[PDB]
Amino acid sequence: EVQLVESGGGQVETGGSLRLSCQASGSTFSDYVMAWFRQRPGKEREFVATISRNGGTTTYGSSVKGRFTISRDNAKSTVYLQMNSLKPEDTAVYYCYAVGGDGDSWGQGTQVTVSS
């Protein structure tokens, strides 16, 4: 039951912090690895940070990686994303993207608008 509904995304000011989440429709969450991408309007998707199956292995991207915070929460059925030291170039629709099983996994699409 992999109906992944992205959650947490919302309007944010440049430099703020917010929680981002996603939920499969009542399933296991350990083995389904999440990935998070930025798609600015006027261009297409890019990548900033991600995670492993463990969740402890916070493998972010190659760009500045201390920006975002990740946590897979098997006890609460949601991933948790805390973005920090923000910049206006992340106004994008993100996708929780649980890799396991279905690779191209999404189905809600969470909007994160970085305001002035």
Added chain:
Amino acid sequence: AYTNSFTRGVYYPDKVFRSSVLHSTQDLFLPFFSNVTWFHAIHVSGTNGTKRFDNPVLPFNDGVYFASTEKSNIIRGWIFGTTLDSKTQSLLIVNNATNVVIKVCEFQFCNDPFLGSWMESEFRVYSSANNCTFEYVSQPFLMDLEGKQGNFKNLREFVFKNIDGYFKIYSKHTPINLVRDLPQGFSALEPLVDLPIGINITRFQTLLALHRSYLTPGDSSSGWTAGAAAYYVGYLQPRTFLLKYNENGTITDAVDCALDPLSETKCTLKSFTVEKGIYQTSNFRVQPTESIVRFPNITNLCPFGEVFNATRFASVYAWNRKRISNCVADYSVLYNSASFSTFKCYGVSPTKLNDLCFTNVYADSFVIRGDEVRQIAPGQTGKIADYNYKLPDDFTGCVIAWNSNNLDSKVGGNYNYLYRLFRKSNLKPFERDISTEIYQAGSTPCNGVEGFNCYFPLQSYGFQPTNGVGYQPYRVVVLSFELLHAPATVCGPKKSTNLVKNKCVNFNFNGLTGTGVLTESNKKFLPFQQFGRDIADTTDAVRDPQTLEILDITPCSFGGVSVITPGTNTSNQVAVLYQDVNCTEVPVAIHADQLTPTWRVYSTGSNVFQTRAGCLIGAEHVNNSYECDIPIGAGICASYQTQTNSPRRARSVASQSIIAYTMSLGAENSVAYSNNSIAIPTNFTISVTTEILPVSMTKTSVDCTMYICGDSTECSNLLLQYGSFCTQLNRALTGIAVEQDKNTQEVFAQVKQIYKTPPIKDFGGFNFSQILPDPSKPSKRSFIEDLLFNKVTLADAGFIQKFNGLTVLPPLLTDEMIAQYTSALLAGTITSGWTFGAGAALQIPFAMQMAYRFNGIGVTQNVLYENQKLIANQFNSAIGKIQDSLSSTASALGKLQDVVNQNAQALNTLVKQLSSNFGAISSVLNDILSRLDKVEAEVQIDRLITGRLQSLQTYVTQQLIRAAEIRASANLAATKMSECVLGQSKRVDFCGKGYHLMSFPQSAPHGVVFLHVTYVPAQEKNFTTAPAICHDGKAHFPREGVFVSNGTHWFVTQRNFYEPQIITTDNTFVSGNCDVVIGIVNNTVY
């Protein structure tokens, strides 16, 4: 126009030779009585394949009968070949009238041999001698003055056979007067030549050059062949015959095999004169109809269309791993429908896909780059070929692909898939690695974080519907057939045929291969259903696996032949018995009718009669029930008279056809319970009969080695290698041989010493004239003995037969001394009495010799001597008429010919098995010995030894059984010899049918003949009788006879002849009084 080939077309098969031999063989022959196309001329607009040509080119068809007639030499050669042109090789054989030249030259197409140039032309036929490959010259195949010097018309029959590159050619020459059509009468066709050609012959045409006719009024253009010479043509068909060879070694006559049932009997029983009798011939069970039959109903399915039509596939790197099983498959739609862009299968043929079976099937599906499509195959290298999904070099089902720029590609740009560059775990084939491979050790000079700190091998692959190959997404799914690891589970869509009713069908229910007729059955199988059984694989009942109805399968449902013939010498009609076929099934392969047109064979005649053992096709059932004859089965028989109702009938019932009544063993001859009134002999007949017992067989021996080996030392090695079988075989044959001698001694040498045939033969009016040996005529075989030694088939079919290992050691007692023994037996029988076996033979005159042999049935010597004259003369007459029937009836001695023929068959079949390879590369010994090296020789030859040995074994055993039963017969023979030659036995119906008198030995080639002279009474008469007479208050009882009354006077007579007497004391025994007894009467005693 059609004419019958009455008897022509017969030719000596091979240059082999025989003499007075009824040999048979099957070669390509012109069938008897076949329609032949009388080609005459153009017969304007009568040409269909050629133009202005009288008798167009015709198909070859592996053999043709040819014959041209003329009043003067006209017809030229022929053209054989396939195209009859320079294009393809063809044959030309022309008569130069000076010589014959045979050429295979590829001549240019001449529409006619006689293009108009009537006769002044110079060999118009020889259009071109290009590529002349063969040439030969011989004496001409000439024709006329037969045609005019005798003023008859002349003939040349020909047969152009192409058999194994060899072009056999035959001919004859003969006058004829009845020029209208081909005559009856017999002939043959000796060859002239063989030609090792090897061409393929399909078409051929006759050649004739118009010299000058007068058919048309042109005075030069009169050259015309519309009304000229003619010729017939037939076709040869693979039918066996039975030939009849001459003393000089000529083909005197021939008979067909498939023409008639009668000819087929002839060739079964190799001869030209069969006698009346049913002849089991060649059986014909059935040709089964079409094919497998199961049903159109319940089956299962794998959800293939679930996944293939699933328009959402996943990453190539994150390739799906899907296992599918426990269904029924179908790869028709995928393999044939144009949905796929690519279909390529590796070690699994797409055609046979459905009929194969696999334990597990895996579906690994994704989307691929268009240019990368090449890398899904065993033996591919590349980024995806190494790091997304790698095929191994082994059995993978297929590599399917189809574009989805419509479905995978979106105009808004689709970067959603990926292709890793060069950086995962190298993919030992089938490894679903999906890990996030960001860093490797974060320090390595190659990738690390030094040098490269911004790399990620996953390269997401953007595309769009209209972008170009390489940017073209092809949907790919692979069917991984996991097979042979476990019980197979996945198979294509079987159960695909309707079932059939009541006709011989080769059926297959879920693997049950068999043939039979399906029928509505009436049981109920439990879910243990699947099939039934009577015994040990008789799968007699079965149900459909797919809709659950049960059925019966009875056999291929029948064939039979039992041809009836009343005898060639006295009729020529034939009717066929079919063993156990309700000929509703029109017996042969129902309504065979693919055979020669022959109403019996074309079995549809209204003259039919079903019985227990099938029906007679040539049947005219009657309800009048005479005596039995050629027996049919379950009572019914045949063979009435010529004139039942119509004169055209023969003794063969209903001539040209046959009836079959039901056997009636005769009439009725009852008497009823008499009160006491006897029916007793007043007159009678002494009479005589015959009997024929084999008492031996011809001796035989078979040196085991020579039969098997015959001087091939290696065979002798291997034969001594098979233990001591040879010793047993030789010993058994020796045992039966010496046994034969013992039987002869026991049968004939019972008496101690010869008592001579008395010189003055004056035997009480009891003339012999025929039984005692010749007065002084050669060999001292008696006249009856002579005819016994001569009417016996002196041919024996001609056993005079030792060729190899065979032999015949001669008997001990020879026929001269054997006849001497017999004559002695006669002499003691006639002069001595019944005592020439009980000690020293005494002497007694023949009148008493038979008076006290009458006393051996209960009649005193008043009887004979009173009628000695007429009784004697009756003996002479009867024994003379013996001579008659023994001299007359064909097949009278059938028992001894039966025996000698049995041994004949034994040995003949033995040598014929000698001529058989029994699985060896050849039958003859020395070549296989000398054609191969040691080991393969010895093994194949050993196969030959084992076959030969088993054959010899069967012969020896069969001989043992035959010998033992002949032993029993011989013991019976000597026993009869004793009881009724050395005495007079009484065991009823042993010494002749009736009250016995005496028996007379007579010699035989291998048996013996007795003459049981019996007492058969006659002229019964009825009188009054009484078991007692009460006289003086006292009953009477007869000593020597019985009291009989005329109705008014009582008379004393005996029990097997009416000889009444007065009632007197001395012949009547007297006890008690009239006791409790029925039938007692008055008119007492003197």
